[PDB]
Amino acid sequence: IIIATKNGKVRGMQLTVFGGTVTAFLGIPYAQPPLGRLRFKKPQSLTKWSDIWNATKYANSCCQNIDQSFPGFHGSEMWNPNTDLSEDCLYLNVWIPAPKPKNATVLIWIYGGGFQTGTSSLHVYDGKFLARVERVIVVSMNYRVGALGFLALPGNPEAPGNMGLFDQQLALQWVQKNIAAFGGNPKSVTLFGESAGAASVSLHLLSPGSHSLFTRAILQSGSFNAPWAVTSLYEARNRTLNLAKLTGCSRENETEIIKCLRNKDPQEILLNEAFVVPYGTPLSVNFGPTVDGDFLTDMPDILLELGQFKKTQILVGVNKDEGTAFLVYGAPGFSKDNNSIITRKEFQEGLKIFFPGVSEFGKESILFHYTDWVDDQRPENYREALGDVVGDYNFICPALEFTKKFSEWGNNAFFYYFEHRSSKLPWPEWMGVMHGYEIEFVFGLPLERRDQYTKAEEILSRSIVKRWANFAKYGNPQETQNQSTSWPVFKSTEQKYLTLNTESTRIMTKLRAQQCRFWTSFFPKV
Ligand SMILES: *[C@@H]1O[C@H](CO[C@@H]2O[C@@H](C)[C@@H](O)[C@@H](O)[C@@H]2O)[C@@H](O[C@@H]2O[C@H](CO)[C@@H](O[C@@H]3O[C@H](CO)[C@@H](O)[C@H](O[C@H]4O[C@H](CO)[C@@H](O)[C@H](O)[C@@H]4O)[C@@H]3O)[C@H](O)[C@H]2NC(C)=O)[C@H](O)[C@H]1NC(C)=O
Ligand SMILES: *[C@@H]1O[C@H](CO[C@@H]2O[C@@H](C)[C@@H](O)[C@@H](O)[C@@H]2O)[C@@H](O[C@@H]2O[C@H](CO)[C@@H](O)[C@H](O)[C@H]2NC(C)=O)[C@H](O)[C@H]1NC(C)=O
Ligand SMILES: *[C@@H]1O[C@H](CO[C@@H]2O[C@@H](C)[C@@H](O)[C@@H](O)[C@@H]2O)[C@@H](O[C@@H]2O[C@H](CO)[C@@H](O)[C@H](O)[C@H]2NC(C)=O)[C@H](O)[C@H]1NC(C)=O
Ligand SMILES: CN(C[C@@H]1CCN(Cc2ccccc2)C1)S(=O)(=O)c1ccc2ccccc2c1
Ligand SMILES: *[C@@H]1O[C@H](CO[C@@H]2O[C@@H](C)[C@@H](O)[C@@H](O)[C@@H]2O)[C@@H](O)[C@H](O)[C@H]1NC(C)=O
Ligand SMILES: CC(=O)N[C@H]1[C@H]([C@H](O)[C@H](O)CO)O[C@@](O)(C(=O)O)C[C@@H]1O
Ligand SMILES: *[C@@H]1O[C@H](CO)[C@@H](O)[C@H](O)[C@H]1NC(C)=O
Ligand SMILES: *[C@@H]1O[C@H](CO)[C@@H](O)[C@H](O)[C@H]1NC(C)=O
Ligand SMILES: [Cl-]
Ligand SMILES: [Cl-]
């Protein structure tokens, strides 16, 4: 089972999935390893090889700091890298149906991780379910994260910024030139991703160098206009410089800095990423997408506002409790191991943690818009309010605003609202429908009966998988057979969206409308 690619022959392996077979090619290199003098530079193209590359195991994950706040707890550790970390991590994976499809639609996954963490090899990113059940091809790639992938000395090719995005872009290029050999249709490629993955997919909509590398886009819990998604050219420099000092690489010649940062073990670079900013938060993106003048030619809010993106269909959506995950990473009085009833004072302190550089008036204005209580006696008023504050500001309102803005230029948009809490979810109940916990459903993990998911979850994943795959194949995320609720287009007027849950799937209008008017009109002025 050998496929000949443009750079050489690759050998895959055979997966038994649901009384059937998927061919997995795990760990195909798609760039020269960005090592030595290649560190921080854009990804260079891969020299040809004469052997049979053995793509039979996930490859090295990119260097990254590991969440060690809940050691031994699956709800945190399920997200930590499950392969050796290395700078030599520019690899991708391909699941194709067996037998080899003819002209299959291709799904390209971009993982999240706040642009600091993440890896394609995670169990909740296993594409074999989608390959088997919908006969699409799934591709996923590793891209550089943290400083190693997003250090920015603007204009300077030694550290131009946005390398991780250019890593992704080079993977998309690989699919364009090689997926035909695997039975995929290069003309039918849907980027999908979650969180920073979703912000990445949205940036590929803007980057002209990506416009011909895919067809459609799916944005799960993320978009480039999210407040955490794009570093200012200022802060990127202040960040690059503060890193140079912490490592002792402060030089007058800016390239002499990069040279100095190139003789540091990655461990030294990662240990210093944290304090590169002055006041971090649980959502800090120390090194992330920047306006490099290359991948990104202008500030994306301007590009969005003036229709300067790929015209195509988008599938956008968010989860019901996007914000609760971050509350247990610093917020006072919070814990995954109790119900986290917090007081007014505790809520106010938590705003200082999530909005450190914000004026008191700004923080009071958040308090005022979110404490008009329907019941003052309700003891978790503040706990739920602080979670909604983080979710509405960081995910739901920018994702909604992205969808209005993008659809205003005549393209079909579909907006979902995931509100099912996984029956196997290891975080406590009050954290609800958390950030990232729609992904297993998108990937069809409840489709394996051999797990402990309920029948209702199997049906929900089954429908989501159909809707996702029909969106990839046909720009339309309906399920047309099992008498399903029709998913209407999101228009700027009606703003209709589809709820996803095991109970009843409903068409609703104008998600978080009052919340988002505050976050999208008033709060940016503070
Ligand atoms: C990439 O993957 C291939 C295939 O691996 C196999 O794929 C599937 C088909 C499945 O069977 C898997 O279990 C398995 O991983 C690798 O192919 C193997 O290549 C090595 C050599 O590099 C072979 O080992 C040699 O086999 C000889 C059989 O004639 C044997 O004589 C060899 O003994 C040595 O010592 C004597 C003593 O003088 C010498 O005379 C010999 O010439 C030899 O050097 C040795 O056992 C395996 O048998 C191959 N696998 C199979 C299943 O046959 C390939 O190596 C791998 N490459 C990389 C870089 O990963
Ligand atoms: C731009 O960076 C300066 C300097 O960063 C400091 O030193 C680094 C090595 C690292 O340890 C950072 O965490 C430090 O912040 C920032 O200046 C500091 O600001 C804090 C309070 O904001 C102050 O108490 C320190 O004394 C300052 N240190 C110095 C050397 O000036 C500055 O705030 C950053 N600018 C922005 C807009 O964030
Ligand atoms: C919920 O727990 C937090 C966290 O406290 C720690 O974790 C607990 C699960 C338990 O193992 C405790 O022994 C630990 O201290 C509590 O937050 C602390 O609250 C105390 C008293 O209010 C305060 O002195 C500490 O500063 C707090 N620490 C942190 C990190 O917030 C919280 O009180 C608990 N809430 C409820 C409703 O039980
Ligand atoms: C420090 N990180 C967060 C921890 C790391 C591992 N835990 C995984 C988890 C995932 C879902 C629920 C519970 C736990 C979460 S991060 O990955 O570097 C990061 C940084 C900035 C971000 C800004 C916006 C959105 C996401 C961001 C992520
Ligand atoms: C649709 O439903 C299948 C089984 O449910 C029953 O059978 C179908 C064919 C209907 O005629 C009706 O009797 C029931 O809904 C599932 O096996 C199948 O996976 C479902 N398809 C999707 C896309 O969810
Ligand atoms: C270690 C721990 O937390 N254990 C608790 C689990 C969940 O894991 C938490 O709610 C989220 O961590 O949930 C319980 O409510 C339960 O349903 O029996 C109590 C149990 O002791
Ligand atoms: C694949 O599909 C495209 C249209 O999407 C078509 O133009 C092309 O000829 C097809 N090629 C093969 C080999 O099926
Ligand atoms: C910095 O050093 C590099 C080394 O090749 C050189 O090309 C560049 O001109 C230098 N810049 C300044 C401002 O001295
Ligand atoms: Cl009160
Ligand atoms: Cl308002």
PDB file of N, CA and C in Angstrom, residues 64-141:
ATOM      1  N   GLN A  64       6.737  22.911  22.905  1.00  0.00           N
ATOM      2  CA  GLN A  64       5.663  23.672  23.534  1.00  0.00           C
ATOM      3  C   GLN A  64       5.692  23.466  25.037  1.00  0.00           C
ATOM      4  N   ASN A  65       5.197  24.468  25.753  1.00  0.00           N
ATOM      5  CA  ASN A  65       5.013  24.345  27.184  1.00  0.00           C
ATOM      6  C   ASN A  65       3.750  23.539  27.455  1.00  0.00           C
ATOM      7  N   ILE A  66       3.786  22.735  28.512  1.00  0.00           N
ATOM      8  CA  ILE A  66       2.737  21.768  28.798  1.00  0.00           C
ATOM      9  C   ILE A  66       1.902  22.282  29.957  1.00  0.00           C
ATOM     10  N   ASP A  67       0.582  22.220  29.804  1.00  0.00           N
ATOM     11  CA  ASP A  67      -0.321  22.449  30.928  1.00  0.00           C
ATOM     12  C   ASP A  67      -0.030  21.463  32.061  1.00  0.00           C
ATOM     13  N   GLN A  68       0.504  21.962  33.177  1.00  0.00           N
ATOM     14  CA  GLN A  68       0.782  21.138  34.353  1.00  0.00           C
ATOM     15  C   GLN A  68      -0.050  21.580  35.552  1.00  0.00           C
ATOM     16  N   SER A  69      -1.183  22.247  35.304  1.00  0.00           N
ATOM     17  CA  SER A  69      -2.041  22.706  36.395  1.00  0.00           C
ATOM     18  C   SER A  69      -2.847  21.567  37.007  1.00  0.00           C
ATOM     19  N   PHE A  70      -3.190  20.541  36.239  1.00  0.00           N
ATOM     20  CA  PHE A  70      -3.945  19.401  36.769  1.00  0.00           C
ATOM     21  C   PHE A  70      -3.247  18.083  36.442  1.00  0.00           C
ATOM     22  N   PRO A  71      -2.069  17.851  37.015  1.00  0.00           N
ATOM     23  CA  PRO A  71      -1.326  16.626  36.690  1.00  0.00           C
ATOM     24  C   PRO A  71      -2.155  15.377  36.983  1.00  0.00           C
ATOM     25  N   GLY A  72      -2.243  14.503  35.985  1.00  0.00           N
ATOM     26  CA  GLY A  72      -2.881  13.214  36.132  1.00  0.00           C
ATOM     27  C   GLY A  72      -4.359  13.219  35.854  1.00  0.00           C
ATOM     28  N   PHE A  73      -4.916  14.371  35.495  1.00  0.00           N
ATOM     29  CA  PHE A  73      -6.338  14.566  35.249  1.00  0.00           C
ATOM     30  C   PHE A  73      -6.576  14.558  33.747  1.00  0.00           C
ATOM     31  N   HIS A  74      -7.406  13.617  33.283  1.00  0.00           N
ATOM     32  CA  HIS A  74      -7.562  13.419  31.843  1.00  0.00           C
ATOM     33  C   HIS A  74      -8.154  14.643  31.160  1.00  0.00           C
ATOM     34  N   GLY A  75      -8.980  15.419  31.872  1.00  0.00           N
ATOM     35  CA  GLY A  75      -9.641  16.564  31.257  1.00  0.00           C
ATOM     36  C   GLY A  75      -8.675  17.657  30.859  1.00  0.00           C
ATOM     37  N   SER A  76      -7.530  17.722  31.526  1.00  0.00           N
ATOM     38  CA  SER A  76      -6.453  18.582  31.081  1.00  0.00           C
ATOM     39  C   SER A  76      -5.443  17.807  30.254  1.00  0.00           C
ATOM     40  N   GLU A  77      -5.053  16.619  30.709  1.00  0.00           N
ATOM     41  CA  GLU A  77      -3.973  15.933  30.018  1.00  0.00           C
ATOM     42  C   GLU A  77      -4.388  15.374  28.658  1.00  0.00           C
ATOM     43  N   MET A  78      -5.699  15.261  28.360  1.00  0.00           N
ATOM     44  CA  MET A  78      -6.084  14.810  27.020  1.00  0.00           C
ATOM     45  C   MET A  78      -5.603  15.773  25.954  1.00  0.00           C
ATOM     46  N   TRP A  79      -5.254  17.005  26.335  1.00  0.00           N
ATOM     47  CA  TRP A  79      -4.846  18.031  25.391  1.00  0.00           C
ATOM     48  C   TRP A  79      -3.334  18.151  25.242  1.00  0.00           C
ATOM     49  N   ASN A  80      -2.559  17.564  26.155  1.00  0.00           N
ATOM     50  CA  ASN A  80      -1.111  17.660  26.102  1.00  0.00           C
ATOM     51  C   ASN A  80      -0.540  16.763  25.000  1.00  0.00           C
ATOM     52  N   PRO A  81       0.614  17.121  24.443  1.00  0.00           N
ATOM     53  CA  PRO A  81       1.152  16.358  23.307  1.00  0.00           C
ATOM     54  C   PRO A  81       1.370  14.899  23.655  1.00  0.00           C
ATOM     55  N   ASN A  82       1.021  14.031  22.717  1.00  0.00           N
ATOM     56  CA  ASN A  82       1.187  12.599  22.918  1.00  0.00           C
ATOM     57  C   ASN A  82       2.296  12.017  22.055  1.00  0.00           C
ATOM     58  N   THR A  83       3.166  12.852  21.489  1.00  0.00           N
ATOM     59  CA  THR A  83       4.412  12.394  20.895  1.00  0.00           C
ATOM     60  C   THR A  83       5.553  13.254  21.421  1.00  0.00           C
ATOM     61  N   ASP A  84       6.775  12.713  21.319  1.00  0.00           N
ATOM     62  CA  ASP A  84       8.013  13.461  21.554  1.00  0.00           C
ATOM     63  C   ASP A  84       7.928  14.875  20.998  1.00  0.00           C
ATOM     64  N   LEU A  85       8.303  15.849  21.825  1.00  0.00           N
ATOM     65  CA  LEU A  85       8.464  17.213  21.340  1.00  0.00           C
ATOM     66  C   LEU A  85       9.799  17.335  20.622  1.00  0.00           C
ATOM     67  N   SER A  86       9.806  18.143  19.569  1.00  0.00           N
ATOM     68  CA  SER A  86      11.009  18.372  18.793  1.00  0.00           C
ATOM     69  C   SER A  86      10.786  19.600  17.929  1.00  0.00           C
ATOM     70  N   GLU A  87      11.886  20.253  17.575  1.00  0.00           N
ATOM     71  CA  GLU A  87      11.791  21.297  16.571  1.00  0.00           C
ATOM     72  C   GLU A  87      11.531  20.694  15.204  1.00  0.00           C
ATOM     73  N   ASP A  88      11.942  19.441  15.004  1.00  0.00           N
ATOM     74  CA  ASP A  88      11.707  18.743  13.742  1.00  0.00           C
ATOM     75  C   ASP A  88      10.307  18.149  13.845  1.00  0.00           C
ATOM     76  N   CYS A  89       9.314  18.990  13.554  1.00  0.00           N
ATOM     77  CA  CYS A  89       7.919  18.623  13.748  1.00  0.00           C
ATOM     78  C   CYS A  89       7.011  18.990  12.578  1.00  0.00           C
ATOM     79  N   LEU A  90       7.558  19.376  11.427  1.00  0.00           N
ATOM     80  CA  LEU A  90       6.706  19.773  10.300  1.00  0.00           C
ATOM     81  C   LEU A  90       6.308  18.506   9.530  1.00  0.00           C
ATOM     82  N   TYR A  91       5.190  17.921   9.951  1.00  0.00           N
ATOM     83  CA  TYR A  91       4.690  16.665   9.421  1.00  0.00           C
ATOM     84  C   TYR A  91       3.180  16.781   9.320  1.00  0.00           C
ATOM     85  N   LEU A  92       2.577  15.896   8.515  1.00  0.00           N
ATOM     86  CA  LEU A  92       1.131  15.855   8.361  1.00  0.00           C
ATOM     87  C   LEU A  92       0.647  14.401   8.262  1.00  0.00           C
ATOM     88  N   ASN A  93      -0.678  14.222   8.417  1.00  0.00           N
ATOM     89  CA  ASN A  93      -1.324  12.912   8.397  1.00  0.00           C
ATOM     90  C   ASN A  93      -2.463  12.881   7.386  1.00  0.00           C
ATOM     91  N   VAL A  94      -2.741  11.682   6.873  1.00  0.00           N
ATOM     92  CA  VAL A  94      -3.761  11.490   5.847  1.00  0.00           C
ATOM     93  C   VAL A  94      -4.496  10.187   6.144  1.00  0.00           C
ATOM     94  N   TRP A  95      -5.801  10.271   6.348  1.00  0.00           N
ATOM     95  CA  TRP A  95      -6.659   9.093   6.354  1.00  0.00           C
ATOM     96  C   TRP A  95      -7.425   9.057   5.036  1.00  0.00           C
ATOM     97  N   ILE A  96      -7.276   7.975   4.281  1.00  0.00           N
ATOM     98  CA  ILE A  96      -8.125   7.830   3.100  1.00  0.00           C
ATOM     99  C   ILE A  96      -8.995   6.588   3.272  1.00  0.00           C
ATOM    100  N   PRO A  97     -10.205   6.599   2.717  1.00  0.00           N
ATOM    101  CA  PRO A  97     -11.067   5.416   2.794  1.00  0.00           C
ATOM    102  C   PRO A  97     -10.455   4.252   2.040  1.00  0.00           C
ATOM    103  N   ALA A  98     -10.787   3.053   2.482  1.00  0.00           N
ATOM    104  CA  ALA A  98     -10.468   1.869   1.707  1.00  0.00           C
ATOM    105  C   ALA A  98     -11.761   1.309   1.154  1.00  0.00           C
ATOM    106  N   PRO A  99     -11.833   1.026  -0.152  1.00  0.00           N
ATOM    107  CA  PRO A  99     -10.684   1.191  -1.058  1.00  0.00           C
ATOM    108  C   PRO A  99     -10.485   2.634  -1.499  1.00  0.00           C
ATOM    109  N   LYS A 100      -9.270   2.952  -1.981  1.00  0.00           N
ATOM    110  CA  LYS A 100      -8.844   4.253  -2.478  1.00  0.00           C
ATOM    111  C   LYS A 100     -10.006   4.958  -3.158  1.00  0.00           C
ATOM    112  N   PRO A 101     -10.426   6.125  -2.684  1.00  0.00           N
ATOM    113  CA  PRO A 101     -11.518   6.824  -3.359  1.00  0.00           C
ATOM    114  C   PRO A 101     -11.063   7.291  -4.729  1.00  0.00           C
ATOM    115  N   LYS A 102     -12.044   7.726  -5.520  1.00  0.00           N
ATOM    116  CA  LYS A 102     -11.738   8.255  -6.847  1.00  0.00           C
ATOM    117  C   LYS A 102     -11.392   9.743  -6.779  1.00  0.00           C
ATOM    118  N   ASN A 103     -12.359  10.593  -6.414  1.00  0.00           N
ATOM    119  CA  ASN A 103     -12.151  12.045  -6.407  1.00  0.00           C
ATOM    120  C   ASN A 103     -12.718  12.635  -5.107  1.00  0.00           C
ATOM    121  N   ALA A 104     -12.235  12.122  -3.972  1.00  0.00           N
ATOM    122  CA  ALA A 104     -12.834  12.407  -2.666  1.00  0.00           C
ATOM    123  C   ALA A 104     -12.613  13.838  -2.197  1.00  0.00           C
ATOM    124  N   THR A 105     -13.626  14.377  -1.526  1.00  0.00           N
ATOM    125  CA  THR A 105     -13.474  15.669  -0.875  1.00  0.00           C
ATOM    126  C   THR A 105     -12.496  15.552   0.285  1.00  0.00           C
ATOM    127  N   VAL A 106     -11.658  16.573   0.447  1.00  0.00           N
ATOM    128  CA  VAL A 106     -10.588  16.558   1.434  1.00  0.00           C
ATOM    129  C   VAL A 106     -10.926  17.511   2.568  1.00  0.00           C
ATOM    130  N   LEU A 107     -10.732  17.043   3.793  1.00  0.00           N
ATOM    131  CA  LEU A 107     -10.927  17.848   4.991  1.00  0.00           C
ATOM    132  C   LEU A 107      -9.580  18.074   5.667  1.00  0.00           C
ATOM    133  N   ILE A 108      -9.195  19.334   5.825  1.00  0.00           N
ATOM    134  CA  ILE A 108      -7.920  19.674   6.447  1.00  0.00           C
ATOM    135  C   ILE A 108      -8.170  20.285   7.818  1.00  0.00           C
ATOM    136  N   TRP A 109      -7.637  19.628   8.847  1.00  0.00           N
ATOM    137  CA  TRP A 109      -7.825  20.042  10.229  1.00  0.00           C
ATOM    138  C   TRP A 109      -6.647  20.866  10.725  1.00  0.00           C
ATOM    139  N   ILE A 110      -6.943  21.992  11.366  1.00  0.00           N
ATOM    140  CA  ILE A 110      -5.928  22.799  12.024  1.00  0.00           C
ATOM    141  C   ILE A 110      -6.284  22.880  13.501  1.00  0.00           C
ATOM    142  N   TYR A 111      -5.424  22.312  14.358  1.00  0.00           N
ATOM    143  CA  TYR A 111      -5.699  22.252  15.793  1.00  0.00           C
ATOM    144  C   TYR A 111      -5.528  23.621  16.463  1.00  0.00           C
ATOM    145  N   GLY A 112      -6.152  23.758  17.626  1.00  0.00           N
ATOM    146  CA  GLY A 112      -5.989  24.925  18.455  1.00  0.00           C
ATOM    147  C   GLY A 112      -4.942  24.680  19.525  1.00  0.00           C
ATOM    148  N   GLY A 113      -4.896  25.602  20.483  1.00  0.00           N
ATOM    149  CA  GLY A 113      -3.864  25.602  21.487  1.00  0.00           C
ATOM    150  C   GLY A 113      -3.368  27.012  21.742  1.00  0.00           C
ATOM    151  N   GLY A 114      -4.207  28.004  21.453  1.00  0.00           N
ATOM    152  CA  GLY A 114      -3.821  29.371  21.747  1.00  0.00           C
ATOM    153  C   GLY A 114      -2.598  29.852  20.999  1.00  0.00           C
ATOM    154  N   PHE A 115      -2.259  29.220  19.866  1.00  0.00           N
ATOM    155  CA  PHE A 115      -1.016  29.433  19.122  1.00  0.00           C
ATOM    156  C   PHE A 115       0.229  29.139  19.946  1.00  0.00           C
ATOM    157  N   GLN A 116       0.072  28.550  21.133  1.00  0.00           N
ATOM    158  CA  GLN A 116       1.210  28.169  21.951  1.00  0.00           C
ATOM    159  C   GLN A 116       1.357  26.666  22.097  1.00  0.00           C
ATOM    160  N   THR A 117       0.280  25.899  21.909  1.00  0.00           N
ATOM    161  CA  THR A 117       0.268  24.473  22.206  1.00  0.00           C
ATOM    162  C   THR A 117      -0.531  23.753  21.127  1.00  0.00           C
ATOM    163  N   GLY A 118      -0.511  22.411  21.173  1.00  0.00           N
ATOM    164  CA  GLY A 118      -1.368  21.587  20.332  1.00  0.00           C
ATOM    165  C   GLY A 118      -0.652  20.593  19.434  1.00  0.00           C
ATOM    166  N   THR A 119      -1.367  19.598  18.930  1.00  0.00           N
ATOM    167  CA  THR A 119      -0.689  18.637  18.076  1.00  0.00           C
ATOM    168  C   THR A 119      -1.742  17.828  17.333  1.00  0.00           C
ATOM    169  N   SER A 120      -1.428  17.499  16.079  1.00  0.00           N
ATOM    170  CA  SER A 120      -2.348  16.765  15.214  1.00  0.00           C
ATOM    171  C   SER A 120      -2.580  15.336  15.699  1.00  0.00           C
ATOM    172  N   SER A 121      -1.683  14.807  16.528  1.00  0.00           N
ATOM    173  CA  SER A 121      -1.725  13.412  16.920  1.00  0.00           C
ATOM    174  C   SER A 121      -2.685  13.155  18.061  1.00  0.00           C
ATOM    175  N   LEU A 122      -3.449  14.157  18.497  1.00  0.00           N
ATOM    176  CA  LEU A 122      -4.338  13.968  19.638  1.00  0.00           C
ATOM    177  C   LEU A 122      -5.495  13.039  19.279  1.00  0.00           C
ATOM    178  N   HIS A 123      -5.906  12.234  20.256  1.00  0.00           N
ATOM    179  CA  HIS A 123      -6.937  11.225  20.044  1.00  0.00           C
ATOM    180  C   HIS A 123      -8.249  11.831  19.544  1.00  0.00           C
ATOM    181  N   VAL A 124      -8.574  13.060  19.953  1.00  0.00           N
ATOM    182  CA  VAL A 124      -9.838  13.673  19.540  1.00  0.00           C
ATOM    183  C   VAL A 124      -9.693  14.323  18.165  1.00  0.00           C
ATOM    184  N   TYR A 125      -8.556  14.091  17.505  1.00  0.00           N
ATOM    185  CA  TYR A 125      -8.319  14.543  16.133  1.00  0.00           C
ATOM    186  C   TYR A 125      -8.115  13.367  15.197  1.00  0.00           C
ATOM    187  N   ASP A 126      -8.379  12.145  15.662  1.00  0.00           N
ATOM    188  CA  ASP A 126      -8.304  10.963  14.818  1.00  0.00           C
ATOM    189  C   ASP A 126      -9.289  11.062  13.654  1.00  0.00           C
ATOM    190  N   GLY A 127      -8.766  11.185  12.430  1.00  0.00           N
ATOM    191  CA  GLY A 127      -9.592  11.337  11.259  1.00  0.00           C
ATOM    192  C   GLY A 127     -10.125  10.058  10.665  1.00  0.00           C
ATOM    193  N   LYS A 128      -9.772   8.893  11.222  1.00  0.00           N
ATOM    194  CA  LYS A 128     -10.175   7.635  10.602  1.00  0.00           C
ATOM    195  C   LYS A 128     -11.686   7.446  10.637  1.00  0.00           C
ATOM    196  N   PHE A 129     -12.367   8.030  11.621  1.00  0.00           N
ATOM    197  CA  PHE A 129     -13.816   7.892  11.672  1.00  0.00           C
ATOM    198  C   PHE A 129     -14.462   8.580  10.489  1.00  0.00           C
ATOM    199  N   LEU A 130     -14.041   9.819  10.207  1.00  0.00           N
ATOM    200  CA  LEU A 130     -14.582  10.569   9.079  1.00  0.00           C
ATOM    201  C   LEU A 130     -14.232   9.902   7.753  1.00  0.00           C
ATOM    202  N   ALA A 131     -13.032   9.323   7.655  1.00  0.00           N
ATOM    203  CA  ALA A 131     -12.649   8.664   6.417  1.00  0.00           C
ATOM    204  C   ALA A 131     -13.560   7.476   6.156  1.00  0.00           C
ATOM    205  N   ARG A 132     -13.805   6.684   7.198  1.00  0.00           N
ATOM    206  CA  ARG A 132     -14.593   5.475   7.054  1.00  0.00           C
ATOM    207  C   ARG A 132     -16.065   5.785   6.804  1.00  0.00           C
ATOM    208  N   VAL A 133     -16.621   6.738   7.552  1.00  0.00           N
ATOM    209  CA  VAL A 133     -18.064   6.920   7.609  1.00  0.00           C
ATOM    210  C   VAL A 133     -18.585   7.848   6.511  1.00  0.00           C
ATOM    211  N   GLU A 134     -17.799   8.842   6.090  1.00  0.00           N
ATOM    212  CA  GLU A 134     -18.230   9.789   5.076  1.00  0.00           C
ATOM    213  C   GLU A 134     -17.395   9.726   3.809  1.00  0.00           C
ATOM    214  N   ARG A 135     -16.405   8.833   3.751  1.00  0.00           N
ATOM    215  CA  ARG A 135     -15.575   8.637   2.558  1.00  0.00           C
ATOM    216  C   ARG A 135     -14.926   9.944   2.104  1.00  0.00           C
ATOM    217  N   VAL A 136     -14.684  10.841   3.036  1.00  0.00           N
ATOM    218  CA  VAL A 136     -13.800  11.973   2.800  1.00  0.00           C
ATOM    219  C   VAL A 136     -12.378  11.574   3.179  1.00  0.00           C
ATOM    220  N   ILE A 137     -11.410  12.334   2.688  1.00  0.00           N
ATOM    221  CA  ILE A 137     -10.035  12.209   3.136  1.00  0.00           C
ATOM    222  C   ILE A 137      -9.795  13.256   4.213  1.00  0.00           C
ATOM    223  N   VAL A 138      -9.170  12.859   5.315  1.00  0.00           N
ATOM    224  CA  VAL A 138      -8.820  13.805   6.367  1.00  0.00           C
ATOM    225  C   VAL A 138      -7.309  14.006   6.362  1.00  0.00           C
ATOM    226  N   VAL A 139      -6.902  15.260   6.289  1.00  0.00           N
ATOM    227  CA  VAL A 139      -5.516  15.667   6.429  1.00  0.00           C
ATOM    228  C   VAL A 139      -5.430  16.565   7.651  1.00  0.00           C
ATOM    229  N   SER A 140      -4.363  16.394   8.424  1.00  0.00           N
ATOM    230  CA  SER A 140      -4.048  17.282   9.526  1.00  0.00           C
ATOM    231  C   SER A 140      -2.541  17.444   9.527  1.00  0.00           C
ATOM    232  N   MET A 141      -2.073  18.593  10.013  1.00  0.00           N
ATOM    233  CA  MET A 141      -0.652  18.927  10.017  1.00  0.00           C
ATOM    234  C   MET A 141      -0.221  19.437  11.395  1.00  0.00           C
TER     235      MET A 141
END
